């Protein structure tokens, strides 16, 4: 199975936090 | 005190399980004051169904029965949930290249979730199957008065390679850490009563900047 298909979104566009 | 904590107890127990519980983490007092800020975000309308990375043809609440909403730290009324997230970071920073060979330089912004009981919960499954950069992913629990053997909601862990599964009940002031890869496959029992969690997933550096550049080119 495509385990994408089961896993928590998250934007992957837009932007991230920087630590 | 970050430096102990990270240095002599979360980067060891990372190591060697994938998976490390820190409890009473920030204490009785805020928590409760991030308990009511999150239920402020409940009460005004902020949460929305649970997504997927790929959606098809099935229901999102097939796989994932919570509802959601992403937090920055910063919003009005969100201050202590701010805090939460600066404690985290604090911490992830004091393990800087000492969680396996990653290099974390960022996070995700918070999702505040919520399980509205009614049997609700989380198929098994990979926080981050396929590489979008996710490497550890690190849980605050809030839940004062949970009683798992009557209200359920046990996130279950089946850690590759060992001879037990880890049962982690999501306790009031509790903080948990794991391998957000297939290390850690995982389920989130069925919830009888509400159930909210505060997740952040820590980005490696050179995997997020791969998984950044496949969604970029398509
Ligand atoms: O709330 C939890 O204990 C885990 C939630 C989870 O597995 C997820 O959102 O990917
Ligand atoms: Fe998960």
Same mark, same amino acid.
């Given at each position: 199975l495509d385990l994408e298909t089961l896993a928590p979104y998250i934007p992957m566009d837009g932007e991230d936090f920087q630590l | 005190p970050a430096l102990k904590l990270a240095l002599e107890y979360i980067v060891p127990c990372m190591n060697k399980h994938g998976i490390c519980v820190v409890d009473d983490f920030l204490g009785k007092e805020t928590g409760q004051q991030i308990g009511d800020e999150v239920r402020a975000l409940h009460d005004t309308g902020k949460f929305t169904d649970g997504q997927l990375v790929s959606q098809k043809s099935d229901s999102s609440k097939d796989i994932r029965g919570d509802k959601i909403t992403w937090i920055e730290g910063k919003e009005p009324g969100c201050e202590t949930i701010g805090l939460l997230m600066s404690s985290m970071d604090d911490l992830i920073r004091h393990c800087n290249g000492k969680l396996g060979s990653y290099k974390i330089n960022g996070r995700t912004k918070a999702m505040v979730a919520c399980?509205? $009981? #009614?049997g609700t919960g989380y198929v @098994?499954?990979? +926080?981050?199957? #396929? $590489? +979008?950069? @996710?490497?550890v992913t690190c849980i605050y629990y809030? #839940?004062?008065?949970?009683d798992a053997k009557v209200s359920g909601g046990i996130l279950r862990i089946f850690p590759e390679g060992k001879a037990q599964f880890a049962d982690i009940e999501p306790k009031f002031d509790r903080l948990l850490f794991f391998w957000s890869d297939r290390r850690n496959p995982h389920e989130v029992q069925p919830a009888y009563a509400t159930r909210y969690a505060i997740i952040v997933w820590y980005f490696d550096a050179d995997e997020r900047a791969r998984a950044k550049v496949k969604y970029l080119t398509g």
């Open positions: - | 399980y509205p $009981g #009614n @098994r499954h990979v +926080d981050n199957p #396929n $590489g +979008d950069g @996710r490497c809030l #839940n004062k008065d949970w």
